[PDB]
């Protein structure tokens, strides 16, 4: 034992761990990019989202499974999968003519259908309209989307500090006025709006909105990330778009908007969804049903687009319900970008 050290140099990072046969992957002397892809993330990350994470660190882990792998941050398992690593994935992303012969999975990122096909098959999946993606890229773009995920977490104070006094070099004064908010309250709307994937990459937009609206809501952030939001209606949009261009969303029917906004309760600043077990029944088939087609589809995230007063209730109610969707307000869509709608839920 010699631990009580381990523990007082450990620094906090994004960990991926690779079983056995995973390794090739990584071994550029045998051809493989993963070391690139995975250390090329945190940069994309960067531009993308607007902080600034630890680099990942890469290990063998033996304990696996030879073709599994394992992502923790902390030391804290947040996600796993396994690839078949001298194999291809194959993806009906919207333009297949027909399917061809495969092993049938769920893609990591997503949980989108999928065929893993033989570098021989590669050919012939291409002339049928597939999309095709290798393992080192679905292990990169799982972890991508895990950080996403957890984006929260690396919005510490130590880097609140770092993105004010990286914007204070050029707009000091906005910076300087902004002292007058409790830091917390910053931290904390920064916190709210990468929780639900939100890039935090116009600092000057979010600190000019808290610094005006805070002072006259008590710093209360339910409504500080409501009103940050509707100010970043271009950089919503963008960060959800389709790479077709297209932000593509699902809606209520008005019926059940108009049910929703019946069950809808204010108390104090946080709004809720009051529902029974039966109600809460209906609305969870309905988004899932439809979420599963759009996913069926080969479109992800699934978006759905209501209200202003329902976003933040409807929003909560679908991650205790584990519905993995994004909840946007219309006050956030900039009329500058291409919609396509997708499909109308009915809870009835």
Sequence with gaps: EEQAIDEVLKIEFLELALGYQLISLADMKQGGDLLERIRGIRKKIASDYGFLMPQIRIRDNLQLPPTHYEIKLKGIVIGEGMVMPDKFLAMNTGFVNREIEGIPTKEPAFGMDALWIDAKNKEEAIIQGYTIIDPSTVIATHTSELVKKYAEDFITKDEVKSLLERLAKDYPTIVEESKKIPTGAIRSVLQALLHEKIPIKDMLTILETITDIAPLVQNDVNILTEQVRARLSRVIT???????????????????????????????????????????????????????????????????????????????????????????????????????????????
């Design 238 to 348: 963008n960060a959800f778009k389709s790479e077709d261009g297209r932000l593509k969303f699902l809606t209520f029917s008005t019926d059940s908007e108009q049910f929703l906004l019946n069950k809808l309760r204010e108390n104090g600043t946080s709004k809720s969804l009051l529902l029974n077990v039966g109600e809460l029944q209906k609305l969870i088939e309905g988004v899932s049903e439809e979420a599963m087609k759009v996913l069926q589809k080969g479109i992800a995230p699934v978006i759905l687009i209501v209200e202003p007063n329902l976003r933040k209730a409807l929003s909560n109610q679908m991650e205790q319900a584990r519905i993995d969707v994004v909840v946007l307000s219309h006050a956030e869509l900039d009329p500058n970008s291409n919609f396509e709608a997708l499909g109308t839920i009915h809870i009835n």
